[PDB]
Amino acid sequence: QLNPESADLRALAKHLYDSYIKSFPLTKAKARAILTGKTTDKSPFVIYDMNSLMMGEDKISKEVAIRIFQGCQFRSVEAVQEITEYAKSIPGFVNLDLNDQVTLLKYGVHEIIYTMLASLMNKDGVLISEGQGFMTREFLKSLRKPFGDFMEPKFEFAVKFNALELDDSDLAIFIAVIILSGDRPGLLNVKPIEDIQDNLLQALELQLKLNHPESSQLFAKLLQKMTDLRQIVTEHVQLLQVIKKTETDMSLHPLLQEIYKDLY
Ligand SMILES: CCCCCc1cc(OC)c(CC=C(C)C)c(O)c1C(=O)O
Numbered sequence: 144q145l146n147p148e149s150a151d152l153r154a155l156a157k158h159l160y161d162s163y164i165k166s167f168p169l170t171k172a173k174a175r176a177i178l179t180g181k182t183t184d185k186s187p188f189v190i191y192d193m194n195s196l197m198m199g200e201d202k203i204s205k206e207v208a209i210r211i212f213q214g215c216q217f218r219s220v221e222a223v224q225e226i227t228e229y230a231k232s233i234p235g236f237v238n239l240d241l242n243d244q245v246t247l248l249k250y251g252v253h254e255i256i257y258t259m260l261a262s263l264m265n266k267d268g269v270l271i272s273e274g275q276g277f278m279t280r281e282f283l284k285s286l287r288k289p290f291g292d293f294m295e296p297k298f299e300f301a302v303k304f305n306a307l308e309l310d311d312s313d314l315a316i317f318i319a320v321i322i323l324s325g326d327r328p329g330l331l332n333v334k335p336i337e338d339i340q341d342n343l344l345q346a347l348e349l350q351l352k353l354n355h356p357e358s359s360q361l362f363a364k365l366l367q368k369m370t371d372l373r374q375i376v377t378e379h380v381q382l383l384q385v386i387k388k389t390e391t392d393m394s395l396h397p398l399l400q401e402i403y404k405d406l407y
Contacts, residue, residue, distance in 0.1 A: 152349045153349070160311065175262075187274060223248075233322060261297075312354065321372075
């Protein structure tokens with residue numbers, strides 16, 4: 144037995160998953176198949192040092208660390224665009240006060256970036272350039288200060304987050320829950336946001352119970368990961384303050400600039 148209330152939650156889950164696939168070109172399922180070797184055709188070129196970097200750099204001038212960081216900032220900008228497209232599909236989102244929509248995106252995009260970045264990670268590195276490349280965790284750690292530390296907390300989070308074994312259908316709802324957070328600073332009308340999140344939370348809970356019936360309290364464990372994300376973002380923003388002051392010759396994309404502007 145499942146009922147009409149639960150039926151509407153399944154319809155919501157379906158809609159979100161559909162929109163997620165439409166918005167995010169490289170899904171977790173694709174990322175895993177690339178990372179696991181379901182493959183003679185999907186094998187990534189692996190960047191693990193300077194030469195391999197130079198070699199890989201014909202499928203994608205200045206210092207290596209800056210090239211990587213700026214490559215990372217550019218992909219973040221693209222992720223922001225994809226996440227914004229996805230957000231508009233969340234029912235109710237575009238009906239919210241325009242200021243609140245902006246606020247939700249402002250505080251939500253980075254937490255989603257790191258959630259979804261985990262899909263592209265294992266303990267040994269991260270998929271890059273639409274999955275055509277793989278950059279090792281050790282290579283990123285070897286970068287001159289203050290870059291050698293920029294990806295470490297993301298990997299640390301990914302390894303733990305990935306142990307939840309969520310699939311894209313789960314993630315579609317979870318990232319919707321993240322965006323529709325009524326606790327964001329400066330929100331004008333919290334109640335309409337809370338009402339949407341409540342329904343998302345309901346959809347998320349049913350989704351995890353059906354998809355992961357033997358994974359006890361998965362719902363609670365997932366919600367607790369919010370803390371980790373919030374912390375990654377805080378550290379990232381701090382590191383960015385360091386970069387701005389040490390690398391005055393390194394331009395930061397304005398979209399990212401505005402998101403970081405007076406954040407937490
Ligand atoms: C000389 C550029 C090397 C790749 C830069 C890069 C770096 C990078 O950080 C290691 C990432 C993933 C990171 C985020 C989405 C934050 C990337 O997706 C990419 C990319 O797609 O090009």
